[PDB]
Amino acid sequence: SGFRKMAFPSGKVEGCMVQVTCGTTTLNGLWLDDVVYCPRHVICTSEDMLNPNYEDLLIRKSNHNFLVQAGNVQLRVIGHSMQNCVLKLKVDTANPKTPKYKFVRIQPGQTFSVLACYNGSPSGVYQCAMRPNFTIKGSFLNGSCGSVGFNIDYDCVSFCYMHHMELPTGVHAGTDLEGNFYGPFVDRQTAQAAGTDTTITVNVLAWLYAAVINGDRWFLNRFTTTLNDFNLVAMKYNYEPLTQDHVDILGPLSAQTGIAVLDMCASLKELLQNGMNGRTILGSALLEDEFTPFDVVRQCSGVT
């Protein structure tokens, strides 16, 4: 009973967090095996950030200029290299707390947990979605760069995000663990446009299935629709178009509840066209889109 915006247990990621200092700049790093990963803008002063030439700035740096501290012990840097927007600092000791892990590039609409860190120390954990426009609506202050996003499958941590930027619009931008930004963002303190964001339709429907499973049924109606009819309403309300792939992923939830995916689409169409009328669904007064169909099944079945 109950449905919550749940993050993964963060323990395996906490044991990987280190502090990285270069000159006067400090941010977070991720220590896996004998490599520490961090945003390359650790080599910049706030002055350099307006238009940085990263290749030129890194050339002024040597292994001894990167101070890596794990808790209270110092790591010895024996190599440094830039890969896209991350620096990989080779250390002489493998992290004894390195969990089984993968680096993955998530798709927009997919979710992950963020372990917000400051000075190498974890402050908190929350669940995010990578927006269709490749931004994240996180909680990041100065010094949070290097904090990572991840998913956990039994004992394997798939790292998917590293925080780099707080855009002037208040949204957050970052890279995968190979240093490639999600979206058109660059690691430069300049005005950068995030595209028009849309609501993740498959996640809203998955969340409506979670509401039915937990008792919130008031929104269910006597109507059905077609993918084409629904997509006309989706277009009007800036929802991602629903595809047969999305319908297929909702299969298990449709099977467990006995509610056809297109009947749930008609309930969503009525909610979009008429609002909530002052009511709530799972304690929320808007349509939640940060739970994937996989999150709902996992939470509703109790997968550990």
Ligand X SMILES: *[C@@]1(O)C(=O)Nc2ccc(S(N)(=O)=O)cc21
Phi/psi of residue 268, each to 5°? -65, -40
Using rule CB under 6 A, residue 145 touches ligand X: yes
SS3 (DSSP) at 274: helix
Q: Please name the residues in contact with 56: beta carbons below 8 A apart, sequence gap of 6 or more.
A: none
Binding positions for ligand X, 44-63, rule CB under 6 A: 49
Given the residues 22, 38, 41, 85, select the one marked as catalytic: 41
DSSP for residue 104: -
Site size for ligand X, by CB under 6 A? 10
Q: Could you tell which of its own copies, ligand X, none binds residue 224, using a CB distance below 5 to 8 A set by kind?
A: none
Q: Which stretch binds ligand X (CB under 6 A): 138-146, 192-200, 216-224, 284-292?
A: 138-146
Residues in contact with ligand X, shown as a per-residue x/- string from 176 to 215 under the rule CB under 6 A: -------------x--------------------------
Q: What distances in angstroms separate CA 80 from CA 43, 179, 301, one per listed residue?
A: 12, 14, 44
Is the separation of the CB atoms in 239 and 227 below 8 Å? no
Q: Shortest approach of its own copies to residue 6 CB, angstroms? A: 4
Using rule CB under 8 A, residue 302 touches its own copies: yes
Q: Shortest approach of ligand X to residue 143 CB, angstroms? A: 4
Q: What distances in angstroms separate CA 256 from CA 110, 200, 291, 296, one per listed residue?
A: 22, 22, 17, 12
Which CB, 79 or 170, lies closer to its own copies?
A: 170
Using rule CB under 8 A, residue 156 touches its own copies: no
Q: Does 41 qualify as catalytic in the annotation?
A: yes
Using rule CB under 8 A, residue 251 touches its own copies: no
- What is the distance between the alpha carbons of residues 295 and 66, in angstroms, rounded to a whole number? 39
Catalytic residues: 41, 145
Query: Using CB under 8 A as the criterion, which residues of the chain lie in contact with its own copies when the complex forms?
Result: 1-11, 14-15, 115-119, 121-126, 137-141, 143-144, 166, 170-172, 214-215, 275-276, 278, 280, 283-286, 298-304
